[PDB]
Design a protein around this ligand. Structure first.
Ligand SMILES: Cc1cc(NCCc2ccc(Cl)cc2)c2nncn2n1
Ligand code: NA
Ligand SMILES: [Zn+2]
Length: 208
C-alpha cells in the first residue's frame, strides 16, 4: 500500500526537511569510523511516504498515548538510519527493526542528529560500509535515511555518556551527559509509535 511522492526542491516542505538534515550534522567521537568523514550532505531526493494502513496504525497508538498523558502525544520529528529502510517504508516499524544491543535495551532508536542516524545506514557501527566499495566513508554510493514522526508520550529520562518501556512511560530519552554538542536520542518499544514520513536519499560530502 505504500506510495512514494517526490518533493520538488522548490517546495517549502523539501526545503524544511533538508534544513533539518544539514543543520543537525555534528562531529562524532569515532572520528568518522562508523558514518564517514563529512560536514554536510548532497541531498539527491526527498520523498513523502504515504501508506494509509500504516498511518492509521500510527494515529490509533498516538491517541492511546495522548489519553494516557494528559492529551499530549509528545510527538517529535526524528531521524532513523537502517539497512532495512525498504522494509520499513512498506510494512512499518516492527520487532525486526529493533537494535537488540542498544544502550537502552532492545528497541527502535531515533536521533535528533541526522549524522547519528547516518552511522547506522550500513549496519550497527556502520557494518562493512557501502555494499559496492565496502567503505563506511563512501562518497559515491547513495545512502538513505528516514525522517519520522515519533510519539514519545511520557519519556523516561536517562542521563548518559522487543523490550518494554519503563513502567508508566512510553519511551526512553538518552540525554547527552559528557559531549556538550550531541543532541538527544530516543527509543520506542512499539513499532506503531513511529511513522516513516520522509525518505531522504543522499551522499555524504568529502570536506574540502
Ligand atoms: C543506536 C541507534 C540505532 C539506529 N538504527 C539501528 C538500525 C539497525 C537495526 C538493526 C540492525 Cl541488525 C542493524 C541496524 C539509529 N537510527 N537513528 C539513530 N539510531 N541510533
Ligand atoms: Na511500551
Ligand atoms: Zn560505495
Amino acid at each position: 500500500g505504500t506510495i512514494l511522492i517526490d518533493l520538488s526542491p522548490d517546495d517549502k516542505e523539501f526545503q524544511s526537511v533538508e534544513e533539518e538534515m544539514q543543520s543537525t550534522v555534528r562531529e562524532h567521537r569515532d572520528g568518522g569510523h562508523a558514518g564517514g568523514i563529512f560536514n554536510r550532505y548532497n541531498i539527491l531526493k526527498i520523498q513523502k511516504v504515504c501508506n494509509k494502513k500504516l498511518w492509521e496504525r500510527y494515529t490509533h497508538r498516538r491517541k492511546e498515548v495522548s489519553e494516557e498523558n494528559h492529551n499530549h502525544a509528545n510527538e517529535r520529528m526524528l531521524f532513523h538510519g537502517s539497512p532495512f529502510v525498504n522494509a520499513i517504508i512498506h510494512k512499518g516499524f516492527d520487532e525486526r527493526h529493533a537494535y537488540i544491543g542498544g544502550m537502552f535495551g532492545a528497541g527502535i532508536y531515533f536521533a535528533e542528529n541526522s549524522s547519528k542516524s547516518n552511522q547506522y545506514v550500513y549496519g550497527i557501527g556502520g557494518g562493512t560500509g557501502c555494499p559496492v566499495h565496502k567503505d563506511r566513508s563512501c562518497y559515491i554510493c547513495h545512502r538513505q535515511l528516514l525522517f519520522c514522526r515519533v510519539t514519545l508520550g511520557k519519556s523516561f529520562l536517562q542521563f548518559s555518556a522487543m523490550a518494554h518501556s519503563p513502567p508508566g512511560h512510553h519511551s526512553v530519552t538518552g540525554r547527552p551527559s559528557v559531549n556538550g554538542l550531541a543532541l538527544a536520542e530516543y527509543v520506542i518499544y512499539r513499532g506503531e509509535q513511529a511513522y516513516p514520513e520522509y525518505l531522504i536519499t543522499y551522499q555524504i560530502m568529502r570536506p574540502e
